[PDB]
DNA sequence: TGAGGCATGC
């Protein structure tokens with residue numbers, strides 16, 4: 457995968473500019489641009505989503521579309537300052553399809569081989585940022601760091617620690633904010649509450 | 664429109 461394209465540097469601007477050159481999997485070809493993380497190395501909370509969506513791929517920034525707006529409300533309800541956040545995605549290029557007779561770009565879940573190929577960028581970000589806690593937003597991100605057998609619905613809101621992760625941060629898994637939109641509106645407010653609770657667990661981690 | 668975890672299809 458991407459490991460040869462990751463330069464030996466902790467400068468997020470250099471990593472981001474290099475990601476524009478990555479050939480670690482096929483996603484780079486149909487996407488507009490790599491969407492790297494956003495934030496500074498002084499962040500103590502890192503949050504990892506699945507992939508850039510349609511709006512993210514057009515803007516070049518993580519979490520700018522509907523799921524990111526919901527994440528924004530979740531952050532405010534958990535009293536998490538954005539000054540403490542570095543936010544990124546497990547996969548750096550937008551994976552999508554279109555209906556043959558349609559124009560809208562329809563997001564497709566990254567394959568597990570794409571997550572594995574792209575994980576060197578995530579490791580590079582984690583070493584550069586040295587977060588005290590990593591929030592895994594959804595199954596793709598959580599499995600990226602915790603193994604393909606990990607079930608976010610089974611262990612969300614738990615403070616976890618694994619050995620093979622650089623810097624031994626606390627890890628907190630939760631559901632991706634888009635799941636609240638995809639699921640029934642009847643469950644949406646309860647689901648938002650659950651997200652906010654998990655985020656509160658993550659913000660109260662003390663190294 | 665914007666998951667999750669299991670199942671089936673080739």
Ligand code: SF4
Nearest residue numbers: 478480481548549574
């Ligand atoms: S997705 Fe990750 S690994 Fe695949 S190309 Fe874009 S950057 Fe390289």
